[PDB]
Write a protein that binds this ligand. Sequence first.
Ligand SMILES: [Zn+2]
Length: 258
Amino acid sequence: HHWGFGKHNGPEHWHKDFPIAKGERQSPVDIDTHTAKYDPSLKPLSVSYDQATSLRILNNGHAFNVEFDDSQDKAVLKGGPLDGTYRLIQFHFHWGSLDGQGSEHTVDKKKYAAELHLVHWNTKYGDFGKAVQQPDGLAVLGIFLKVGSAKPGLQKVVDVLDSIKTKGKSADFTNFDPRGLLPESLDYWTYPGSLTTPPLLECVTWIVLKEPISVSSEQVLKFRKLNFNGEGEPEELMVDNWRPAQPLKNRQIKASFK
Ligand SMILES: [Zn+2]
């Protein structure tokens, strides 16, 4: 028995094993576009993914991660509200059972079909494990997905999902370019938050892009064929692996645009 997204172990339960779930800077949150403040001081984001080296793609029981080599500054994020260099370690998605839900963050209460998270850690702290223990340890780039036209750059990921259907399964996944998942504009909101699954550590600077990226219904449908369970166990479909919006509390959401 452990945390998950079921009826008896879902987000509403998590606080029993992870008290920080009721913390002061939990994520996700609803972004109220009229209360967000434009900050002229925010510099443009600097995304350098030209040397990214993907290694593998694995089904960890609550989502699937596409892991990168983070032993050097190959794929990094700089600028924006960040101070220093953040290395990309993995990206994953959260999606729903229906096109009307799936994203973790919402915009004026609007939910998207899914949300892509590109996780980076602050190199000053030496490794990922140390970085999550710091208030400025992680930077997570969030991108919304809406259902419409297919996204060519995502098909490579969609095609290998069959090989990692169940929990614990992994597959080699080299030469994948994450630049094919980025929207045209890099305008963003940003706020201090946490990691949206256990252990919900409040070490994250969140950078949520304003412009969604479109994926086809067929592509999202393949996400919904994955399993939370391990092979040989009763099938439960991996859907609705998103945490509901949390109280903003004493936080301000800033926008890089007006
Ligand atoms: Zn996530």
